[PDB]
Amino acid sequence: VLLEVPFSARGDRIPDAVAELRTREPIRKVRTITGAEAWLVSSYALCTQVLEDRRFSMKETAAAGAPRLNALTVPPEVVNNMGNIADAGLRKAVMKAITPKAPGLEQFLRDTANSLLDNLITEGAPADLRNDFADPLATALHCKVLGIPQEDGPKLFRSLSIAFMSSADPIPAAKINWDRDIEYMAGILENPNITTGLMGELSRLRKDPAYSHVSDELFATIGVTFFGAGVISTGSFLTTALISLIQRPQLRNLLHEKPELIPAGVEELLRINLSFADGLPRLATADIQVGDVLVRKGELVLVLLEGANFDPEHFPNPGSIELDRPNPTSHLAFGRGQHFCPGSALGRRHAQIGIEALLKKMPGVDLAVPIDQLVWRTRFQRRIPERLPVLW
Ligand code: HEM
């Protein structure tokens, strides 16, 4: 019987099995939720090998009849979204619009984190740091980044509990939501009041006849895809980083006292983060040797990020947060190679600012329920608790 993936929906603790698997079988046959076979890769060396070799293709994971990690929740072409962006001549533009350096942006993040936190302090403990802090901070950020009205955020957010499912079967709601969100974005592109952020930029490139080969659909897809990827990734990461920090009171206290180390703290929280529920999928486009396995053309490979990130061969004392590591950014939390996360800078600043605000307003933050009372979302592309009850 094949080892089934994923092993655990819990985002607070790495299963003991990962260390077992990594040492003895850093590439191992598994079965996914669709019933497909796959190669799960779990050492830093093999994970990096896979991500650095472009013949392990992201685009081709959408190929018809390919073994699948999970059901598509987007059109097959949209799996190649970053490639379409590059081909449309929109790459450095997209990347420029999603940098945290934008005028006023970091102060907006800061003031938004502090306002959310003041509201929670007024309502009284317990507070839910996912639904009433991390996710709203993520959503407010991405509305600003995209240049769309803040009041439009909640509804785009609504789609995400389905869009980012990791399902054995197709999801009818995913298509309905996708089509509505695409239509919304299309409308944003023609709205002359939208002059800032990613959509403001994309909108004026759309008016340019030099971009006449670029469909309206792709422009709109970029907005929907970046909003969703950024909101789900930042909100989910911050949420489970807060659990990591809460469980390490002396770290909490150290960062509160020495906020200059908060970036180093966040980098370690990224390294040990369990937010990705599944390995990153790739399809082999050739026969390629990975460890003791010849991966065959057409086979699915899953790059287990926490495999690499907890690998003591690369990170000594891997379960420990150490702020003085010599190569602290070398984890795979943002991936590697061709598909390295284009939002990584913004991801770091969202978490840095969110944590700094929280530590200053709630220096005594702690869980308000036993950790085993958290409800872990299942069959989802991220590991998150439904609610994160705290007191302070
Ligand atoms: C802590 C926050 C974040 C984490 C941990 C994270 C993680 C990742 C990872 C691991 C990948 C690589 C996927 C792969 O190679 O298969 C990725 C790619 C991606 N991320 Fe992020 N991400 C974060 C924030 C963001 C933000 C803020 C945005 C946009 C606003 C974003 C947009 C994207 C997009 C569009 C891709 C696909 C790139 C491609 O296909 O080439 N992410 N992210």
Side-chain angles (χ1 to χ4, degrees), residues 2-12 14-19 21-23 26-58 60-90 92-95 97-154 156-206 208-216 218-312 314-392:
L2 263 40
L3 184 63
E4 300 270 353
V5 290
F7 309 130
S8 179
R10 286 184 80 97
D12 61 336
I14 192 168
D16 287 10
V18 178
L21 204 54
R22 181 196 301 118
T23 55
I27 176 157
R28 167 82 190 250
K29 212 135 188 40
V30 302
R31 194 177 300 280
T32 77
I33 213 81
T34 70
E37 297 187 9
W39 297 110
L40 185 65
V41 179
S42 66
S43 68
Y44 190 89
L46 294 192
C47 289
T48 58
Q49 189 194 327
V50 177
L51 295 181
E52 286 192 354
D53 189 341
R54 66 197 71 192
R55 301 172 297 168
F56 290 109
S57 171
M58 176 185 281
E60 290 304 316
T61 64
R68 292 210 45 79
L69 171 63
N70 47 218
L72 291 166
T73 57
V74 297
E77 60 271 18
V78 179
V79 166
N80 194 41
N81 186 55
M82 216 71 208
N84 298 332
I85 288 174
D87 293 350
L90 299 164
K92 302 224 268 75
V94 168
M95 262 290 233
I98 65 167
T99 42
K101 298 186 211 291
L105 183 57
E106 286 153 305
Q107 191 67 222
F108 176 81
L109 257 172
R110 192 175 288 101
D111 290 348
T112 302
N114 284 310
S115 290
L116 290 169
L117 289 161
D118 288 337
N119 291 352
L120 295 173
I121 290 175
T122 299
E123 291 290 305
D128 179 351
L129 295 184
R130 182 174 161 262
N131 292 287
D132 296 325
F133 181 59
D135 278 356
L137 187 59
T139 296
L141 173 63
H142 286 81
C143 285
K144 177 66 61 165
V145 162
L146 260 72
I148 56 177
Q150 296 280 144
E151 29 293 312
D152 291 350
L156 285 169
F157 181 81
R158 182 154 193 288
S159 304
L160 299 186
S161 70
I162 298 183
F164 284 89
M165 287 177 167
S166 186
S167 172
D169 298 297
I171 313 170
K175 175 148 172 45
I176 293 163
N177 280 335
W178 180 257
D179 289 342
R180 189 191 56 254
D181 294 343
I182 287 289
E183 184 177 273
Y184 165 81
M185 281 300 172
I188 288 289
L189 287 172
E190 308 164 72
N191 182 345
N193 304 310
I194 306 298
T195 70
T196 57
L198 176 65
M199 299 315 295
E201 177 56 8
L202 288 181
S203 174
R204 73 181 66 98
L205 304 192
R206 193 186 72 105
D208 170 9
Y211 290 92
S212 292
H213 70 291
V214 186
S215 70
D216 292 307
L218 169 58
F219 281 123
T221 294
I222 293 159
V224 174
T225 55
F226 274 68
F227 183 89
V231 170
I232 206 67
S233 301
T234 62
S236 303
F237 168 64
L238 179 55
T239 297
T240 52
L242 288 168
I243 294 170
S244 295
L245 190 62
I246 286 171
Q247 292 184 317
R248 292 171 174 78
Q250 300 312 139
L251 180 62
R252 182 196 66 174
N253 296 349
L254 180 66
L255 301 183
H256 178 247
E257 289 304 288
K258 298 190 194 182
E260 71 270 14
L261 302 178
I262 284 169
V266 171
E267 208 71 27
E268 278 290 271
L269 293 164
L270 287 158
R271 180 180 68 77
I272 68 158
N273 104 80
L274 303 169
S275 69
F276 275 61
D278 308 297
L280 304 177
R282 294 295 189 267
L283 203 81
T285 62
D287 298 349
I288 303 168
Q289 193 70 31
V290 182
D292 300 322
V293 173
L294 188 71
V295 177
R296 299 290 222 151
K297 178 170 188 180
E299 291 186 336
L300 180 64
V301 177
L302 302 173
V303 177
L304 187 73
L305 298 184
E306 67 263 40
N309 289 339
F310 283 82
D311 186 343
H314 187 83
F315 294 118
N317 309 316
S320 198
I321 291 189
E322 301 182 349
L323 305 179
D324 61 349
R325 293 184 182 277
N327 188 9
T329 76
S330 66
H331 59 77
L332 306 190
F334 295 119
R336 187 180 199 79
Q338 192 188 147
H339 295 289
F340 190 86
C341 180
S344 71
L346 187 64
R348 287 182 175 104
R349 294 259 65 214
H350 169 270
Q352 290 166 189
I353 291 174
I355 289 168
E356 188 182 359
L358 190 135
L359 292 173
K360 286 184 170 194
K361 300 260 196 203
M362 300 181 170
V365 62
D366 193 2
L367 285 167
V369 306
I371 186 65
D372 287 335
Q373 289 306 117
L374 296 189
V375 178
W376 291 100
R377 187 172 288 185
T378 51
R379 300 236 171 161
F380 199 68
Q381 295 174 220
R382 300 289 185 282
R383 291 186 284 210
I384 42 165
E386 293 286 345
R387 292 161 297 281
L388 177 48
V390 303
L391 50 75
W392 57 91

